[PDB]
Design a binder for this molecule. Structure first.
Ligand SMILES: [Zn+2]
Ligand SMILES: [Zn+2]
Lengths: 767, 770
């Protein structure tokens, strides 16, 4: 119940609107807590919450504390954090609950409270907090961890974004406004905080900054400036100055550290504040701290559930911190092979800019861990940085960087020559910039290893990126990645998407796909709160039917489903194409195997190959009707409208057995082509023990009879947590395996280590 | 996605605040739909909702309809309702979804839309009937042959929540009075905030008035009467919050003439809605369609609030609500669908009010019987309970009509801040109510043939079963056969619920053939009981100590659970050490002795018909060896320190006992229940995603749901669904049949056998006079 006192819209609104001298707010903190719990965790049976709150008040009163941030943080810290061996650590039995808490609350206040009220032996702040197990620590020391999936909030944890926003409040406000005009965002803001708006966003950021300044004053114990008396209502802090009597006083003060917005500075200030408030605290200032914590947690929730603030990460600072953080606190790095994913810029200048920043941050990180003749002691250009980096040997002391540009897929627009024409364009320009960079500096092929296409699945199919990936392969880009199976209108649709990626993308031996959740999630736990009928687009429906037919043709036990899929596919094609003649499932298959062709090749230097790739097709005398049908599929306005049309499909359209058969067919294809799956920990899972990673790892009770191993790799990407790490996810998997599956530490370590080593085996780094 | 357009706080607020001539509200209906879906069904993965809404707009546009109540109702009706055999029915494959929908939307508009846009043969004059059932010849034949038996009907009075809407419209100021007197209560403020944040009594009143005014206006257009002139002044739905509209200087009332004498009846509502939809068959004015939308939204919001929850109930103290109850329990045929009906009512603390309620119930029953049999009735117009009983003595149990068995409640309330012993004032109020009941039974001995049972319902945690034992014993002697007591419904822990059921068994005077209640604690599995629960649950120290003692008692003899028994004993001794502030040593044996005396009346000897249990403690105080248990129990009852420690809270791990141990405790309680031949009334009800996970199937012994060491327990049926509008015993019977046939693969015959066994348990364990 402690999380609802640190993350609550109702509590924030109430505390920020009433005066600072109101006193006696217990009734209201309690009511707001129940509202927050109903809004967030609805399934609590309405009396467990009452009892938990009663126990919380009982603990506070017995320990002679007041309901407030200090007491809540103390309780959380005593319950989760200790001291063991080196620095604070989390209980092994409590790590899962700690992760769930981290999805709502920031860890820095809790660690400050632990350092104040239960310090270890007579610490530099480090996030996140890990558990301790000698087997896991020895394995990490010996083999190190390998990162293959880091693309969530840029590549930094959401917790430094709070301080970045406080540093650039007007950049953050600019981004929020430019994106609040977007519907997606209005809906998200309403779902988190109904009455948010950009104006209260700005006011909350300013209130947080002013509260931070005031509480820094009391943390240092400096004289409580006089204008504090005029401060009566927290809304007064929404502004850059306070008016006491005629005068306008600023909230700024002096800070010890040069960077006052750094997490070290935040930790120092919080530790000092809690040390001064060890025994008690003023009610008003404690409420100010409460409001600051609530604002921070609300901002982090909004951020995790989501260009410019990202542009501000285009210096050799965010990347240097990234590499220093991937490296542990020891001499030898915790992370050996790091894949760094960045959005490619449409401006050659901005692209050169981003890449110079990344490479120079990496070089500085290396210079802080090895001493050598660096040629250019102060590199200024990518060429100089590469001259520096050529001297670095893969000894294994530090991280080894492999850069992977993204490709963001956007939804098709109202009017274009063919679907995703403008998107394919923008991708073309980005790829052109990348290829010109690789040309003008061939050595950049040793650091740019891979083109990943992330973003929403439904916005662009895999077949759209095939020409781009082929051209990049020739421009010198080894290894390809493509997000598949993450979000799908239907499980069959996701499995079909993975199969299309396999049979259309130029994935070679050792390449990695992505999440591939559609072939890991079971049909049993995929339809748990879903409506009995799901609506999809006609194009996806037809492609799914064709895929079902293709995969269940040879299955003696599923021939009925294959035949029904064929019949439905022919029918749906009959309207989608407005065909008068008869089209068989065979010719439908022929039509849909040509999706990998470039649209503007021959049916609508390095690009020449796939400009003429269609000529072979148009040469084959028997490929008439597939060709004309595909041209209708691409250009015909009627066919495009019918493609965007929607149709309903039953949830049990195919039985669990048939869905598992399709999943296992895709599994077999993946194993045959030796394609790995980067699986980070992520809606339908109540508990982490239901995650499909365990099915893939082959745990008894989770693996299905006809499953095939698939070379799972690890990735540090948790959509809804603050301050996550590769070590954190490794420890989470270890804890789940040891406690929920009963595996011994050695067996659990073997299972997690196999995935981790898959990261190294299927790394994109230059050998 | 159609439910979010008929039940949505955001949509209601938006539609009721913007002007009636705004036009083009699709963007906003869509946004509000997504907000409503996030608030209600959060687990939809944020794109299934987008796609469903896109398909909905596609259907509306293709069928040339406008986004509005008419289109939504038409879609729902085509999707769920048909015509088969007699009247409209629901698909067998669609009945589960229809029930889930009924938890949010009222069925009357949908049935009106079905009757308008897809009527059955024009030979069966359709009279509106709720609820809509599926059709299966096996189930219908079974119902015709054996009839259905009701053993649990105490939820919203005893009527469906859907007639309460019209009752509120009939008595808006009674409903407003109740809402205000109860909005001062915290429980209620929290509930109102959780349903509609900015509800307040004032907007409650305004919404009721808006609904009434919209009903009047739409009745005018349903009859097609001249659209009175003041409609032009009506520009903003908030104008309808008031009893009159001001056009130019004048104040015009919204009332009009209605065909039927009772304009607030469900027949009148159905007629008006059918006429309105017939007139709007092809199109509708945007403003009036929005008024209908607002009316539907207000009705659904009110029903949601009502189902999730004295005076409006007092207004059910005439021989009308009970007559309708009996007519509804009786089907539309000559022979009643329901054979043995148990009627549960709250006993009044005023002898006048109690006589009043009972005369109303008995006279309603007599009128219902008079409408189905012709006989010499002695008093053609009974005025007193004696005359009604003279009438009813002539009725033979032929089986044509319902047979009534009345069961007074006993509402348990939380203990108050200061009293002699816990629940002293509650035990008092129960004492006065029981005294009134006994004086009634005296002054009319024939009332023992109609008052058969004293049930104690209400919240479990507010009063333990041991508090009602003296009351039940005294009532048993006053002539009250059969006893009932709600147990296992809500518990801080599963062990606590199982312990509560065991305490009810070993303390209440439950004889052979008695029924307990829900008893969910011994039906819900430990696997699906901890699914969204925190790893630590906090309880009171008294419950913790009693649970530890119960664990020890039940796992003493279990060779595989001796470790858990020993740990429970040790923890019990420890917790007793502070709770009692004891300096000496107290063993688990003497703790058991202390806690077996909870059935004693507090004010017997340690603090006419009551004489027996006033002296029941004398035997205890006579036993020379019962010293330390007695003094310890006296400390437990009176000591302020012990009472504060009892109210204290302590945390218990969710996996304090393994699933195996919890199942062992459940099966021990099962064996006790089977040995004492105590039945369980199980109505359909938080941790179940789908109905197939309900514990009724475990009790019925379905493969995959029953556990190895389970014991059959004589489950009876009850029509009590906490979160549905317009539910029935037939509806629940059909729901069980559908689940058994579709989700468990059982043939119609096997499913009918399984449901029929529970239904027949209702008759076997009936409280009716033989
Ligand atoms: Zn990803
Ligand atoms: Zn009940």
């Amino acid at each position: 119940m402690e999380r609802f006192l640190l993350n609550s819209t109702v509590l924030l609104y109430r505390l920020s609107t009433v005066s600072l001298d109101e006193v006696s707010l217990d009734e209201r903190v309690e009511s707001s807590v129940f509202l927050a719990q109903y809004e967030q965790a609805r399934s609590l049976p309405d009396h467990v919450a009452k009892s938990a709150w009663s126990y919380l008040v009982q603990q506070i009163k017995q320990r002679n504390m007041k309901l407030g941030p200090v007491a809540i943080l103390r309780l959380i810290a005593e319950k989760f954090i200790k001291n063991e061996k080196g620095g604070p650590k989390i209980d092994l039995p409590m790590f899962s609950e700690w992760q769930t808490l981290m999805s709502r609350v920031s860890c820095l206040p809790i660690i400050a409270c632990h350092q104040v009220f239960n310090p270890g032996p007579a610490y530099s702040f480090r996030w996140p907090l890990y558990p301790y197990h000698p087997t896991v620590e020895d394995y990490i020391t010996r083999e190190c961890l390998h990162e293959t999936h880091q693309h969530l909030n840029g590549s930094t944890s959401a917790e430094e974004c709070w301080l970045d926003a406080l540093k650039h409040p007007e950049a953050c406000l600019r981004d929020f406004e430019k994106g609040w005009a977007s519907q997606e965002m209005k809906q998200l803001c309403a779902q988190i905080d109904p009455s948010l708006t950009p104006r209260i966003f700005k006011d909350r950021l300013q209130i947080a900054c002013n509260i931070r300044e005031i509480l820094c004053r009391v943390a240092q114990g400096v004289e409580l400036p006089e204008w504090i008396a005029s401060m009566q209502n927290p809304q007064q802090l929404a502004n850059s100055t306070i008016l006491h009597n005629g005068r306008e006083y600023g909230f700024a003060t002096v800070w010890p550290i040069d960077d006052k917005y750094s997490q070290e500075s935040e930790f120092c200030w919080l530790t000092g504040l809690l040390e001064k408030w060890r025994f008690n605290a003023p009610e008003g200032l404690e409420r100010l701290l409460w409001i600051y914590l609530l604002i921070q947690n609300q901002y982090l929730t909004l951020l995790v559930q989501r260009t410019m603030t990202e542009l501000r990460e285009e210096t050799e600072k965010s990347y240097l911190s990234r590499f220093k953080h991937a490296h542990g606190a020891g001499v030898y790095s915790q992370v050996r092979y790091l894949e760094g994913r960045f959005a490619p810029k449409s401006d050659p200048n901005k692209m050169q800019k981003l890449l110079f920043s990344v490479l120079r941050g990496y070089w500085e990180y290396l210079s802080a861990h090895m001493s050598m003749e660096w040629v250019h002691e102060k590199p200024l250009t990518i060429s100089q940085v590469l001259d520096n980096l050529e001297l670095v040997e893969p000894h294994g002391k530090c991280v080894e960087l492999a850069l992977v540009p993204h490709f963001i897929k956007r939804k098709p627009k109202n009017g274009e020559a063919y679907p995703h024409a403008l998107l394919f364009k923008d991708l073309k320009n980005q790829a052109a910039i990348l290829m010109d960079m690789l040309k003008s500096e061939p050595r950049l092929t040793g650091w740019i290893r891979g083109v990943d296409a992330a973003a929403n699945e439904m916005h662009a199919p895999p077949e759209l990126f095939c020409p781009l990936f082929r051209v990049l392969a020739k421009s010198g880009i080894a290894h390809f990645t493509y997000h598949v199976g993450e979000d799908f209108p239907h499980l069959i649709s996701g499995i079909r998407s993975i199969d299309d990626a396999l049979r259309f993308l130029p994935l070679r031996n050792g390449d990695r796909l992505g999440h591939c959740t559609a072939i890991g999630i079971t049909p049993s736990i995929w339809k748990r709160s879903l409506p009995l009928s799901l609506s999809m687009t006609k194009e996806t429906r037809l492609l799914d039917l064709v895929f079902i037919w293709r995969e269940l043709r040879s299955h003696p036990e599923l021939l009925r489903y294959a035949s029904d899929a064929a019949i439905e596919a022919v029918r749906l094609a009959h309207k989608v194409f407005s065909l008068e003649e008869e089209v068989s499932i065979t010719t439908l298959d022929q039509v849909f195997e040509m999706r990998g062709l470039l649209a503007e090749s021959e049916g609508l230097s390095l690009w020449l190959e796939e400009y003429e790739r269609a000529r072979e097709l148009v040469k084959t005398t028997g490929m008439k009707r597939p060709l004309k049908l595909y041209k209708q599929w691409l250009t015909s306005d009627n066919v495009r409208k019918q493609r965007a049309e929607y149709v309903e499909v039953a949830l049990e359209y195919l039985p669990d057995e048939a869905v598992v058969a399709l999943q296992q067919a895709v599994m077999a294809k993946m194993a045959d082509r030796n394609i790995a799956i980067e699986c980070p920990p992520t809606s339908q899972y109540r508990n982490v023990s239901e995650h499909h990673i365990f099915r893939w790892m082959g745990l008894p009770g989770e693996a299905i009879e006809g499953d095939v191993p698939m070379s799972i790799c690890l990735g540090s990407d948790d959509p809804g947590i603050f301050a996550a790490d590769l070590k954190s996810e490794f420890y989470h998997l270890f804890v789940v395996l040891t406690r929920k599956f009963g595996l011994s530490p050695a067996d659990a370590l073997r299972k997690v280590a196999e995935v981790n080593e898959n990261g190294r085996i299927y790394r994109f780094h230059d050998v």
